[PDB]
């Protein structure tokens, strides 16, 4: 009944919660704005993107943030008639430190105007708010240890949160130090029956990823780990469809059934290497899956095995399907950017672009290049399948070589490919392909593609076919020309990019840059996205 992944493409660190008969899953967004994606569902089978809480700079200011910084694992809960969202803003993703700050924002509705952030702490990421049955609230998070002679993951800390005083009270204390899997993080507390279940993620978000659970009669612990721990992991099984299974969250349906949401990666193996050595590449990044749970001796177990299955029995609730959140062909007729579209770090303002200046078009004013962590006029959407076709049409009249606009497949500032309309001093308007492979730049087209002066719209297309993708262009929307270069999809995956931050996924979108200072506009007639 439930077919995983439930949330395809870049949708990591799922935080599932129930509000009456409605189910929500908050996922990490990192540098993508607006921050935190929230999906909704009635039956746990069918889902749809409904909100992005962090829409204001006062809530989330990520200009200048390093790749894979910003919003890490979020925590969404429901209590006292409102939603509670705990999020982090990571400023440093490399080195001995991991400078970050945890905040809290609330809202009675999932898609309403969330409150201004309440400062919590900064001792570590993966902060989570636990609502105990006695009315008390506690904040959990991992402790980051920068000291040389100690492992960076110093354990799980807890501290009571005063709702009235809007701050953490008392003193924090370590309640769990993890198992031999180490890299203990993603703490989530649950008061079920006569025990307090502490759920954590261990082994890192790569292939050693796992979800461990422990219990204690008292909240302070010590916690005893599950007899068959980890309750979720596929490290030992490279053949399993779902990999990197960890960073989970538990939910009890209104039908008294138990499920476990968790992130996962579906890798491709294009190099023909030994899967045991080279586990694979995930262009779709880390996605969200949901496993079913069963109880035995007051211990939760994953139905079908700890590895995680693709097909899972759905709860006993009537089916509720939702309409598509995006049209196959977006004609930009609405004054609001489609919810599936996001910008880098900063909000989409009149400065970056407009949907009203040029009716039925997405106008993007040229700004900084694709290697900039500050201001990019780039509107993109996630790669939610390894078999799709994205397309757009752009009216662009560049006057200098520092002006380019087109279709761009992107992971981070150091990894991307771009097919843009630009200006050559001798040839005039040309269609150029630029590649940034882990900061290794190249413009492989020896024979530049010249664009006739009478061409109003330059049609750009990209076809993703599992391990490879190709670019196509057209001047009249009938005759398409293929750019004879088989680009590798693995180069836009979490497993390929360098750096301490590799927590996003491949994106495809419309972009315009003007490093000359003229902020030249680029008009995109439409944006098509169709999965096979």
* Residues designated as active site: 13, 185
CA atoms within 13 A on the CB side of 98: 23
What's the closest the beta carbon of residue 395 comes to a second copy, in angstroms? 22
DSSP secondary-structure letter at 177?
-
Residue 331: other Cβ atoms inside 10 A: 13
Cα(365)–Cα(351) distance, integer angstroms: 7
Pairing of strands 468-474, 458-465: antiparallel
Q: Find, among 435, 429, 422, 421, the residue nearest to 485 by Cα.
A: 435
Q: How do beta strands 403-412 and 415-424 pair?
A: antiparallel
Q: How far is the CB of 307 from a second copy (least distance, A)?
A: 12
Q: Which is nearer to a second copy, 132 or 208 (CB)?
A: 208
Interacting residue ranges for a second copy, rule: CB under 8 A: 63-66, 91-92, 94-97, 99, 101-102, 119-123, 144-151, 180-183, 202-204, 206, 208, 235-236, 238-239, 272-277, 368-369, 371-375, 400-402, 414, 436, 439, 441-443, 514-517
The angle at the Cα of 22, spanning 17 to 24, to the nearest 5 degrees, equals: 40
485: helix, coil or strand?
A: strand
DSSP string, 435-484: EEETTEEE---SS-EE--TT---EEEEEEEETTEEEEEEESSSSS-EEEE
Rounded Cα–Cα distance for residues 238 and 235 (Å): 7
**Closest separation in Å from C-beta 292 to a second copy:** 25
Least separation in angstroms between residue 520's CB and a second copy is: 12
519, 351 Cβ separation under 8 angstroms: no
Query: Within the chain, what is the greatest distance between any pair of CA atoms?
Result: 78
C-alpha 288/C-alpha 5 separation (Å) is 5
In sequence order, which residues have a C-beta less than 8 Å from that of residue 317 and are 6 or more positions away? 21, 42, 43, 44, 253, 254, 255
Residue with smaller CB distance to a second copy, 15 or 88: 88
Nearest approach in angstroms of CB 513 to a second copy is 9
The runs of H, that is alpha helices, within 38-154 are none
Q: Cβ contacts of residue 11 below 8 Å, gap of 6+?
A: 5, 27, 37, 39, 263, 285, 286, 287, 288, 382
Minimum distance between the CB of residue 497 and a second copy, rounded to whole angstroms?
15
Smallest separation (angstroms) from a second copy to the CB of 98: 8
For residue 404, what is the DSSP state? E
Name every residue whose Cβ is closer than 8 Å to that of residue 236 and which is 6 or more positions away in sequence. none
Residue among 2 and 62 whose Cβ is closer to a second copy: 62
The least distance separating a second copy from the CB of residue 159, rounded to whole angstroms, comes to 10
């Amino acid at each position: 009944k439930i077919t995983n992944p439930v949330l395809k493409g870049f949708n990591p660190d799922p935080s599932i919660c129930r509000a009456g008969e409605d189910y929500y899953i908050a996922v990490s967004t990192f540098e993508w704005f607006p921050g935190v994606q929230i999906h909704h569902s009635k039956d746990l089978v069918n889902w749809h993107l409904v909100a992005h809480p962090l829409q204001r700079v006062s809530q989330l200011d990520m200009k200048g943030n390093p790749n894979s910084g910003g919003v890490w694992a979020p925590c969404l809960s429901y209590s006292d008639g409102k939603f509670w969202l705990i999020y982090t803003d990571v400023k440093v993703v490399d080195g001995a430190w991991k400078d970050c700050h945890n905040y809290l924002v609330t809202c009675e509705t999932i898609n309403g105007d969330w409150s201004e952030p309440i400062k919590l702490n900064s001792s570590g990421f993966d902060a989570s708010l636990f609502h105990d049955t006695d009315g008390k609230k506690y904040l959990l998070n991992m402790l980051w240890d920068h000291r040389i002679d100690r492992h960076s993951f110093g354990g799980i800390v807890i501290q009571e949160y005063s709702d009235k005083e809007q701050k953490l009270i008392g003193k924090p204390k370590v309640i769990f130090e993890g198992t031999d899997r180490k890299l203990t993080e993603a703490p989530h507390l649950y008061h079920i029956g006569n025990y307090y279940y502490l759920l954590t993620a261990e082994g890192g978000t790569r292939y050693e990823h796992a979800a461990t659970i422990a219990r204690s009669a008292n909240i302070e612990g010590p916690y005893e780990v599950h007899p068959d721990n980890p309750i979720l992991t596929s490290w030992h099984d490279p053949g399993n469809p779902l990999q990197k299974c960890g960073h989970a969250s538990i939910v009890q349906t209104h039908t008294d059934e138990w499920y476990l949401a968790h992130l996962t990666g579906r890798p491709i193996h294009p190099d023909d290497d030994s899967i045991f050595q080279q586990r694979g590449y995930c262009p779709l990044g880390r996605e969200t899956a949901i496993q079913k749970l069963y109880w035995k001796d007051e211990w939760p177990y994953v139905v079908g095995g700890k590895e995680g299955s693709l097909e899972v029995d759905a709860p006993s609730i009537p089916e509720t399907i939702f309409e598509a959140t995006y049209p196959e062909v977006d004609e930009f007729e609405d004054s609001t950017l489609n919810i599936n579209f996001q910008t880098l770090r900063i909000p989409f303002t009149n400065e970056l672009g407009s949907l009203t200046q040029a009716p039925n078009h997405l106008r993007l004013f040229g700004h900084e290049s694709l290697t900039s962590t500050f201001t990019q006029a780039f509107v993109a959407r996630r790669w939610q399948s390894l078999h799709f076709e994205a397309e757009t049409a752009v009216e662009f009249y560049p006057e200098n070589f520092q002006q380019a606009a087109g279709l761009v497949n992107y992971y981070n500032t150091e990894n991307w490919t771009a097919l843009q309309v630009t200006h050559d001093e001798e040839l005039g308007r040309i269609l150029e392909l630029t590649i940034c492979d882990n900061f290794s730049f190249s413009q492989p087209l020896n024979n530049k593609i010249v664009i006739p002066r009478e061409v109003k719209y330059v049609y750009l297309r990209v076809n993703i076919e599992k391990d490879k993708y190709y670019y196509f262009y057209s001047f009249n929307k009938e005759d398409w020309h293929k750019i004879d270069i088989a680009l590798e999809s693995k180069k836009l995956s979490d497993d390929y990019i360098r750096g301490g931050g590799f927590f996003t996924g491949a994106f495809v979108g419309m972009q315009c840059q003007d490093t000359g200072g003229n902020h030249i506009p680029a008009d995109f007639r439409y944006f098509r996205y169709k999965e096979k």
